[PDB]
């Protein structure tokens, strides 16, 4: 699965739904800074809440409880093409988790599970 299929599906997915929460804050830890922030040159931050939020929009983090089953279900489509490329994503999703282990603090809980996020999937 190219990056360009990976990034152009995560978004397409949720495009209508993650353009709510970089208004939220003020703008989209993406965009905030081309690679000048940290994690990965977006945002580290602000990044764990503000992309947290497309997160907590499809029943995935209910305020400081960090899940992943939701994903596991949008992983199936967004990453058509091969059936391990699925299974794929679902055991990178683990290193992330057992990473951000539920933190206390919203921002603290993204900012861990997007970096894992960044390290094994870039995406
Ligand atoms: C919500 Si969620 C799957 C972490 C998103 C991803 C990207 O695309 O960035």
Do not use: W
């Given at each position: 699965?190219?990056?360009?299929?990976?990034?152009?599906?995560?978004?397409?997915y949720l495009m209508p739904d993650?353009?709510?929460?970089?208004?939220?804050?003020?703008?989209?830890?993406?965009?905030?800074?081309?690679?000048?922030?940290?994690?990965?040159?977006?945002?580290?931050?602000?990044?764990?809440?503000?992309?947290?939020?497309?997160?907590?929009?499809?029943?995935?983090?209910?305020?400081?409880?960090?899940?992943?089953?939701?994903?596991?279900?949008?992983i199936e489509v967004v990453h058509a093409?091969?059936?391990?490329?699925?299974?794929?994503?679902?055991?990178?999703?683990?290193?992330?988790?057992?990473?951000?282990?539920?933190?206390?603090?919203?921002?603290?809980?993204?900012?861990?599970?997007?970096?894992?996020?960044?390290?094994?999937?870039?995406?």
């Amino acid at each position: 699965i190219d990056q360009d299929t990976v990034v152009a599906k995560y978004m397409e997915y949720l495009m209508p739904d993650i353009m709510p929460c970089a208004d939220e804050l003020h703008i989209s830890e993406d965009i905030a800074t081309n690679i000048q922030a940290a994690k990965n040159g977006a945002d580290m931050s602000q990044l764990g809440c503000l992309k947290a939020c497309v997160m907590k929009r499809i029943e995935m983090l209910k305020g400081t409880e960090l899940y992943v089953e939701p994903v596991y279900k949008m992983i199936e489509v967004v990453h058509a093409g091969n059936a391990d490329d699925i299974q794929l994503v679902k055991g990178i999703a683990n290193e992330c988790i057992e990473n951000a282990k539920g933190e206390t603090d919203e921002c603290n809980i993204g900012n861990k599970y997007t970096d894992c996020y960044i390290e094994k999937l870039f995406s």
